[PDB]
Amino acid sequence: AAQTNAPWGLARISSTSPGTSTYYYDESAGQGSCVYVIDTGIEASHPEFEGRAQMVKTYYYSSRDGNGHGTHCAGTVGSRTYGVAKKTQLFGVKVLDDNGSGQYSTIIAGMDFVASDKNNRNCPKGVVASLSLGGGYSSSVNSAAARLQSSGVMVAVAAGNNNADARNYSPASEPSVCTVGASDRYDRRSSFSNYGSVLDIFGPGTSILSTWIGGSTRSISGTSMATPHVAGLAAYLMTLGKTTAASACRYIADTANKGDLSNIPFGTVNLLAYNNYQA
């Protein structure tokens, strides 16, 4: 399939070259897979989600996304216009309040929720969890991310927007999950994107247009915005049978665009998420 005038990030994950605007992808589009978006919740009623998004858990008075961040990330995963896997199932776990804030303990409980809740969902193609969140280093947040990964969920976490080594941030520093840095439309590392040996991949992170609360859209920047690209890419690749949850991050890196990003610090992988679709 071909989505003309796609957001630049979608066109990039299906391109060996920057500066194109058509997203190419196999029409399976993540059908039969599931992506948990553990964030501020999802505006499931948004027409871009086509009934495929829903709230499955909240730790606050409402499951409604009053922030927009989780709606944006879900839109990049699987919204029809801005998503990578336009047919995947989107489950919202509201571990962040409408300020975008969350206690690490609520975040840990959300990861253990997904690790069990997937046994209540129909995901024959597999399960993805997109963690567009992060704070300082925590071995307990890291271990929850490892349990989630160990449980059979592909876990994609943001590297962080500190322009630092992601080694001092959780869950970005958990080596078993898929830690994602952010790039821009000119194949530069995003000026904010964390780096380091713990990173596994880079996704489009600067000026990403996706869904927003109130049925709207907007463009925002962050490693929280590169993470749903790889998360959506993983649900896409697992539906095609190219990889499993335990292997998808290592697979995505094997098939990524090599040595195409500039301003990548020594010791950080120079890999850009690439669906390797041939139309």
Chain centroid offset of residue 95 CA: 16
Tokens encoding 82 = 């801005």
CA distance 169 to 16: 31
Experimental method of this PDB entry = electron diffraction
Beta-strand pair 135-136/169-170: antiparallel
At 132, the amino acid letter reads S
Q: Residue 84 annotated as binding?
A: no
Q: Is 108 helix (H, G, I), strand (E, B) or coil?
A: helix
E strands within 17-168? Answer: 23-24, 33-39, 53-58, 89-94, 126-131, 135-136, 153-158
CA distance 196 to 173: 10
CA distance 137 to 1: 41
Report yes or no: 229 and 247 within 8 Å, Cβ to Cβ: no
Is residue 46 part of the annotated active site? The answer reads no
- Burial tier of 31 (Cβ tally within 10 Å: 0-12, 13-18, 19+): middle
CA 163, 164, 167 angle in degrees (round to 5)? 140
Is residue 39 part of the annotated active site? The answer reads yes
Resolution at which this structure was determined, Å: 2.3
Is residue 69 part of the annotated active site? The answer reads yes
Strand partners of residue 262: 188
Q: What are the backbone angles phi and psi of residue 170, rounded to the nearest 5°?
A: -125, 145
CA distance 30 to 78: 8
Report yes or no: 133 and 67 within 8 Å, Cβ to Cβ: no
Q: Residue 260 annotated as binding?
A: yes
Tokens encoding 163 = 């322009």
Tokens encoding 219 = 């463009």
Q: Which CATH superfamily is domain 2-272 in?
A: Peptidase S8/S53 domain (3.40.50.200)
Query: CA 63, 73, 118, 24 torsion: positive or negative?
Result: positive
At 220, the amino acid letter reads I
Pick the catalytic residue: 28, 39, 130, 229? 39
User: Could you tell me the residue ranges of all domains in the chain?
Assistant: 2-272
Nearest to 156 by CA among 176, 184, 126: 176
Q: How far is CA 93 from CA 56, 105, 109, 171, in A?
A: 6, 14, 10, 16
Strand partners of residue 182: 203
Beta-strand pair 23-24/201-204: unpaired
Pick the catalytic residue: 28, 33, 69, 187? 69
Query: CA 28, 31, 32, 38 torsion: positive or negative?
Result: positive
Q: Residue 200 annotated as binding?
A: yes
